[PDB]
């Protein structure tokens, strides 16, 4: 069992950091290319993560009383969008300068955030199948990344409370017939890969940001704690990948639209209802 994020996957920052120096950026990109997952510690202030955590835990009962509770593959892995109220939309979360420095370098200047969602891992949750969140664009072809998932733990993630299992280096694998229509990896392909490069699982302190290739094999695992484990999820895509826009209140248009940190957004005159 690991006690901390492995050194080879990790870059240590403070929330004051606005940009990586050239050497740090080179290393961030080398890690994303080789391993397909990068852990940035010390990115977000406690004041932001506290507010987002409280809001998602406060919203969980409304999510659980819906007619169809939207669940990811297996019981206890709940899809939950964080609020898009103006008071809970933070530039350092939506438009993080370090995150976009990395995504611009990997995916290009016109890369755009097209997801503002989240994952509530409930006490007694089941084991998700190993999957990729975004597919390879053609079967049996090696191609560069077109998307980067940006994961924001809203509490300390532990081995106990369902820190995500990640398969380092799996993002470049695209063998024939190995992914089903749900993006699940065939068990035979998992066992082949496990012999060459086994999965890792590690604690991630709140205030960290995980950047990973959208094609990285991973799985939610059981939350064996007494408390729901909230994750806030964003995904940066090349400009040419079709995605529906994020609905945002036109009250944040002033700072979201016209940034060189692009968001695929539709600005709405009223309130936006994130749960329905
Ligand atoms: O919340 C997690 O740790 C994993 C969830 C997941 O990977 C998914 O639902 O696609
Ligand atoms: Ni997933």
From Swiss-Prot:
Keywords: Antibiotic biosynthesis, Iron, Oxidoreductase. Its cofactor is Fe cation. InterPro entries: Fungal_Metabolite_Diox, Phytyl_CoA_dOase-like. It is an enzyme of class 1 (oxidoreductase). GO terms for biological process: kanamycin biosynthetic process. Pathway: Antibiotic biosynthesis; kanamycin biosynthesis. Gene3D superfamilies: q2cbj1_9rhob like domain. It catalyses: kanamycin B + 2-oxoglutarate + O2 = 2'-dehydrokanamycin A + succinate + NH4(+) + CO2. Its EC number is 1.14.11.37. Signal peptide: none annotated. One of its GO terms (molecular function) is 2-oxoglutarate-dependent dioxygenase activity. PANTHER family: PHYTANOYL-COA DIOXYGENASE FAMILY PROTEIN (AFU_ORTHOLOGUE AFUA_2G03330). Belongs to the PhyH family. Mediates the conversion of kanamycin B into 2'-dehydrokanamycin A during the transformation of kanamycin B to kanamycin A. This is Kanamycin B dioxygenase. It comes from Streptomyces kanamyceticus.
